[PDB]
Design a protein around this ligand. Structure first.
Ligand SMILES: Cc1cc2nc3c(=O)[nH]c(=O)nc-3n(C[C@H](O)[C@H](O)[C@H](O)COP(=O)(O)OP(=O)(O)OC[C@H]3O[C@@H](n4cnc5c(N)ncnc54)[C@H](O)[C@@H]3O)c2cc1C
Ligand SMILES: Cc1cc2nc3c(=O)[nH]c(=O)nc-3n(C[C@H](O)[C@H](O)[C@H](O)COP(=O)(O)OP(=O)(O)OC[C@H]3O[C@@H](n4cnc5c(N)ncnc54)[C@H](O)[C@@H]3O)c2cc1C
Ligand SMILES: Cc1nn(Cc2c(C)noc2C)c(=O)s1
Ligand SMILES: Cc1nn(Cc2c(C)noc2C)c(=O)s1
Ligand SMILES: Cc1nn(Cc2c(C)noc2C)c(=O)s1
Ligand SMILES: [Br-]
Ligand SMILES: [Mg+2]
Ligand SMILES: [Mg+2]
Lengths: 486, 483
C-alpha cells in the first residue's frame, strides 16, 4: 500500500512515467484508472484517451475513410469496376477498431502483471493529503474506498474530456467518445468545431455515409484550424469542400430538438436550421481536474482550469506533479509521453530534463492530411525582425491522373531571414504526417533553409519539394508582409 | 555556331547544367538530344531517362500497381464490392503514363523556345575536336552532319543504357525501355536482376497481370537488392513472395528460345526452365560513351566505359566535363542535377563546389517501398571501431486490420557508437520514401541518435519509430556483431 510513485490516469503520460519509474529505477509504482478496456461508460481506460477514444482508433477510421478516395482514384490508373456495387460497411470498421483497441488494452494488462512493483488499481483517484491517494468506486467523493495509497510522489495524468456547450438539447448531441461507437454510420451529420477532431471526423463520416448522405462541419468563426498555417487552413477547407463536405463558417448551434423520427433539428445562432442524424460536438477539450479533489491539498489551477506546472511538471505542492492534457497546453500524446519520461528522469533518475514544447511535429489526419512543426509565419513575424516564407503549392502528377486535381500539395518553410534558421515547416498533402517527423529533428538541430536546399532530393516524392526552395516567396519585415525586402 | 557551353544529353544533369549556365550565369548554351519526345526508337529523349523511361513513368505505374493492395486491404476497413468485376486495365495505365510523359516533353520544348541563349539541337552529338561538337543524323559517325557547334566548354551528359547479357536468344528479351511500351500486360514475366528496376517492375507486372498470370524475378546471388540494408533485403523478399511473386535466387538465364506459340523458353544456368510471355533484363546500366567518339579528343574513360572525372566533374581535357550516369558513380536524377549545378557554379561562377555523393537519401518503389540514407551496418562496421544498430520491426496495426499481416515496417538507425553520430537510416514500409527525405537533412547536420530520440514523435505515424529508439538492438565492435 506504500509506493515511491502513485499515478492517477493510466494514459499516454501516466503509463510512460509508471513503466519508466518501475523498469529504469526499480521504483515502486501504483497506477489508477477507472476502466481496464475501451468504451462506455468511461470511454478512456488503461492505455488512456489516445489508445481507447483518440489517435489510435481515429487513425484506423481515417485509414478506412481513405479507401473512398483510393477507389475513385484507381480508375485513372486503369482499375475497372462497377461503382454501383461499392458499400462502406461502418459496422465492420467499428468491430475491427474495437478488436484492435481491446488487444492494446490487454497488452497493457500483461505489462502491469509481468512488471515487478508496477501495480494497476481500478477505480477513481483523488487526493486525500500531500502523500495519500484514495481509490474510490465512483467519481463521487462519498463512494467506498477500494484503496489508500501512500505516495513519496503523486503524478496527476487524468488528461481531458470533451466540452459540450450548455445549449438546449445538448443531450441529443454526442462527442468524439460516442462517435467511436455509433451502431450505424449517420446519413447526415453536423460536426461542431473547426479543430482537428471535427475536421478528422467530418472526413470519416464523409467516406462511410449511406447514399444521399451529407457531412456538414460548422465553425463559429471565419476559417477552420486556427493555429495552423493560413495557406493550409484555406486549402484544407477547399479540399474538404471538393470531397462533398459542406463547411458552415461563422455558424454555431443555439439549440437542438428531436424530430418525431428521432433525427436532430439544429437551430444556429444565425437563425438557420439543419436536420441531421448526428450532432457531434468537438468545440474543445478540458482538463479532468474536478474528480481529483484538488481543494483537499491546494493544487493551483490556471485561469483556464489546467493544473499549473513549472518546466519540471511540478505543482505548487512538493511531491505532486502533473503532465499531459490536465496541464491544458499542447494536447498531444507524444508531448504527454515526453513530460512523463522527463519527470521520472528528473525525480527518480537524478537527471533533470524539461520537455521542449517548441518545434513539436504534429499532424491532422484530414483528407488530405497536414504535417506541421514550429512557428506559423504570423507568429514568427511578431518575434523576428525579418521572416522569409518559401512556398511550393501544386497538384502532384499522380493526382492529375487520379482525377483529384484539387489535391494541391502545400510545402511552406518559415525562416528567420537574418540567419536562415528554419522556424516552421507546414505541409498539406498525402504523406505530410510521415514527411514532417524528421523535420522535427532538423528543427532541434537548428537547420537553416540552406541545410534543406543543399540536401539532395529523393525523387520522385512530395518530400523533395522541401529541398528545392532557395528563393523566398515573400517576407515579413517588422511584422509587415511584402513581396521584396527593402 | 559558337556557344559558351555545349551539352550532349538533354537529361536530368544536362538540363540543370544548361539552364543554370544560361539563366544564372548569362552564358550562351547549346543542348543536344536524339529525340524530342518519349519512346521508340531511342526511348530516352528531351528531359532524360528519368522523365521518359525512368523515375517519372515508373512511379506512376507503381502508384497504379499499389491499387491491387488497396483493393484487397479496403475489405478489412468494411469496404464491400464485387471482387469478380475488378480488372487492371494496363492499356489505360500506359496511355495515362504516355500523356504525362509527353506533357513534360512538350514543356521542355517550350522552355527551349522561351529561354534566350538556350538552344536545343536534335540528333546525335559527338566530339569532332576539343572545342567542336558535331550533331549527326544517327549514332553512326558516317551519318549526315546536321550541325557543328563551336564550344568554349563541353559537358558530356548522355547518361546510361540497359546492359544485355551476350546469351543465346538475347534478341527475344527486353529491357525496362520496352517494358514501358508493352501494349498488353504479360501473363507470365521473368524480371532478371535483384536491383531496384527488376524489383519495381516485378511489383508493376504483378498488379496488372491478367487472371492466372505469374511474375518471376531471378537473381544470380542469394538475396535481392545488394547494397541495401540486409534486414530490409530479407523482408522485401518475404513481402514480394507474400504478394505472389516467385523470387528465384542463385538463378540466371543461360539462353532464351521461342516456344512454337511465340512465348519465351528460358533455360537457367542451373538447367531449370521457365516459359514466359516477357523476359525483362534489369541486370545493370552502363555509361553511354560509345557514340560520343571521345577518341577524337582523348577524354579518359575507365575500362567500364564511364568518363573518369575529378570531384569537380572535370575530365583530363580542360573545358570538357562529365556529370550524371555517364560518370558511373551514383545513378540518381537528383545526383546528376546536383553535379550539373556544382560544375556550372565552379566553371562559370568561380564558386567552387563538388557534389557530396555520401548520405544521399534514395528510395526503391517496391511494394512495400524502401527509403534509405547513408551506410548499411556491414559497411559502417569496417570504417568504425564501435557501430550501434537501433532496429524496430513490426506489422503496423492498420495491416493487422487490412489482412496484409506480412507488411512489417522496418526502421533501422546505424550509429558510430563512440559519439552517437548517425551513419545510416534504412526504412521499409508505406511512406518510407517520404520519411527519409528530411532524414537526409539530419545526416547533413551530423545528427546523433540522441537528436532523434529527444525529438517528440508525430503520432500515429510509422516515422515516429525513428524518434522512439533509445537502446541499441546489437553492435559491431571491430567488425564483429555482438548482440
Ligand atoms: C478524438 C481524439 C483524437 C486524438 N488524436 C490524436 C493524434 O492523432 N495524435 C496525438 O498526439 N494526440 C491525439 N489526441 C490527444 C491525445 O489523446 C491526448 O493528448 C493524450 O491521450 C493525453 O495523454 P494524458 O497522459 O494527458 O492522458 P490520457 O491519455 O487522456 O489518459 C488519462 C486517463 O486518466 C483516467 N482518469 C481520469 N480521471 C481519473 C481518475 N480520477 N482516477 C483514475 N483514472 C482517471 C482516464 O480513464 C484515462 O485513461 C487525440 C484526442 C482525441 C480525443
Ligand atoms: C527504369 C529506371 C528507373 C529509375 N528510377 C529512378 C528513380 O526513381 N529515382 C532516381 O533518382 N533515379 C532513377 N533512375 C535513374 C535516373 O533516370 C538517372 O540517374 C538520370 O536520368 C541520369 O541523368 P543524366 O543527366 O545522367 O542522364 P539522362 O537523364 O539519362 O539523360 C541522357 C540523355 O542523353 C541523350 N543522349 C544519349 N546519347 C546521346 C548522344 N550521343 N547525343 C545526344 N543525346 C544523347 C539521351 O537521349 C538522354 O535524353 C531510374 C532509371 C531507370 C532506367
Ligand atoms: C506551434 C504551432 N502549433 N501548430 C499545430 C497545432 C497543435 C499541435 N495544436 O494546435 C495547433 C494549431 C501549428 O501549426 S503552429
Ligand atoms: C470499387 C471498389 N473496390 N474498392 C477497392 C479499391 C480499388 C479497386 N482501388 O482502390 C480501392 C481502395 C473499394 O474500396 S470500392
Ligand atoms: C550508401 C548506400 N546506398 N544505398 C542506396 C543505393 C543506391 C542509391 N544505389 O545503390 C544503393 C545500394 C544503400 O542502401 S547504402
Ligand atoms: Br547475396
Ligand atoms: Mg506488477
Ligand atoms: Mg532558347
Amino acid at each position: 500500500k506504500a509506493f515511491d510513485l502513485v499515478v492517477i490516469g493510466a494514459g499516454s503520460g501516466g503509463l510512460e512515467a509508471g513503466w519508466n519509474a518501475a523498469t529504469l529505477y526499480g521504483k515502486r509504482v501504483a497506477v489508477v484508472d477507472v476502466q481496464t478496456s475501451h468504451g462506455p461508460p468511461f470511454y478512456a481506460a488503461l492505455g488512456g484517451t489516445c489508445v481507447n477514444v483518440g489517435c489510435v482508433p481515429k487513425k484506423l477510421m481515417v485509414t478506412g475513410a481513405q479507401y473512398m478516395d483510393h477507389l475513385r482514384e484507381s480508375a485513372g490508373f486503369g482499375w475497372e469496376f462497377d461503382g454501383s456495387s461499392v458499400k462502406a460497411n461502418w459496422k465492420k470498421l467499428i468491430a475491427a477498431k474495437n478488436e484492435a483497441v481491446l488487444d492494446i488494452n490487454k497488452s497493457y494488462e500483461g505489462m502491469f502483471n509481468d512488471t515487478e512493483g508496477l501495480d494497476f488499481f481500478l477505480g477513481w483517484g483523488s487526493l486525500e493529503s500531500k502523500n495519500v491517494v484514495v481509490v474510490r468506486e465512483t467519481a463521487d467523493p462519498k463512494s467506498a474506498v477500494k484503496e489508500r495509497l501512500q505516495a513519496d510522489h503523486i503524478l496527476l495524468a487524468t488528461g481531458s474530456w470533451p466540452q459540450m456547450p450548455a445549449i438546449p438539447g445538448i443531450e441529443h448531441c454526442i462527442s468524439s467518445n460516442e462517435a467511436f461507437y455509433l451502431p450505424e454510420p449517420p446519413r447526415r451529420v453536423l460536426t461542431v468545431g473547426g479543430g482537428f477532431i471535427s475536421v478528422e471526423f467530418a472526413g470519416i463520416f464523409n467516406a462511410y455515409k449511406p447514399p444521399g448522405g451529407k457531412v456538414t462541419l460548422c465553425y463559429r468563426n471565419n476559417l477552420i484550424l486556427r493555429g495552423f498555417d493560413e495557406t493550409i487552413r484555406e486549402e484544407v477547407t477547399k479540399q474538404l469542400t471538393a470531397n462533398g463536405i459542406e463547411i458552415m463558417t461563422n455558424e454555431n448551434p443555439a439549440k437542438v430538438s428531436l424530430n418525431t423520427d428521432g433525427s436532430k433539428h439544429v437551430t444556429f445562432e444565425s437563425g438557420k436550421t439543419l436536420d441531421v442524424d448526428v450532432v457531434m460536438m468537438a468545440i474543445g477539450r478540458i482538463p479532468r481536474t474536478n474528480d481529483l479533489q484538488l481543494g483537499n491539498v491546494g493544487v493551483k489551477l490556471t485561469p483556464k482550469g489546467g493544473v499549473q506546472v513549472d518546466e519540471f511538471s511540478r505543482t505548487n505542492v512538493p511531491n505532486i506533479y502533473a503532465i499531459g492534457d490536465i496541464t491544458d497546453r499542447l494536447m498531444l500524446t507524444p508531448v504527454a509521453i515526453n513530460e512523463g519520461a522527463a519527470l521520472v528522469d528528473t525525480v527518480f533518475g537524478n537527471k533533470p530534463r524539461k520537455t521542449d514544447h517548441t518545434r513539436v511535429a504534429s499532424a491532422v489526419f484530414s483528407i488530405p492530411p497536414i504535417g506541421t512543426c514550429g512557428l506559423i509565419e504570423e507568429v514568427a513575424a511578431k518575434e523576428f525582425e525579418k521572416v522569409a516564407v518559401y512556398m511550393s503549392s501544386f497538384t502532384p502528377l499522380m493526382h492529375n491522373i487520379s482525377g483529384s486535381k484539387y489535391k494541391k500539395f502545400v510545402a511552406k518553410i518559415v525562416t528567420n531571414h537574418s540567419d536562415g534558421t528554419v522556424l516552421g515547416v507546414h505541409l498539406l498533402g498525402d504523406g505530410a504526417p510521415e514527411i514532417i517527423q524528421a523535420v522535427g529533428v532538423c528543427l532541434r538541430l537548428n537547420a537553416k533553409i540552406s541545410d534543406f536546399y543543399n540536401t539532395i532530393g529523393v525523387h520522385p516524392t512530395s518530400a523533395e519539394e522541401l529541398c528545392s526552395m532557395r528563393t523566398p516567396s515573400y517576407y515579413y519585415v517588422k511584422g509587415e508582409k511584402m513581396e521584396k525586402l527593402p
